[PDB]
Amino acid sequence: SMSVKKPKRDDSKDLALCSMILTEMETHEDAWPFLLPVNLKLVPGYKKVIKKPMDFSTIREKLSSGQYPNLETFALDVRLVFDNCETFNEDDSDIGRAGHNMRKYFEKKWTDTFK
DSSP states (O other): OTTOOOOOOOOTTHHHHHHHHHHHHHHSTTOGGGSSOOOTTTSTTHHHHOSSOOOHHHHHHHHHTTOOSSHHHHHHHHHHHHHHHHHHSOSSSHHHHHHHHHHHHHHHHHHHHHO
16 A cells, blocks of 8 residues: 555566567467467458457567566467467367467466566
8 A cells, every 4th residue: 555565576577588488489389370460351250259369479569669568468468369269269170279289388488487
């Protein structure tokens, strides 16, 4: 509350560390469904169904231009990529499986780096 603060967690490396996690996600062999925005002209149903599209290239641009206020807003956009994928793709599809694999990969790096 006013003039009463918990001790200061060092957040000065968060930007660099989220960049490293994102590089590791970008270079994973199963990243290909997630590298670029879904083409809304060429994929029927996507525009109407997926209210907030997100992809790794869009996160990389937001990261590089100071559009994440903190490391939690960064994790929210990564998770959004996988939540969108589960909404649109069957679990038993190449893209569906890719999404589960990447979410697992992300969540481990996240815990090991920050928790």
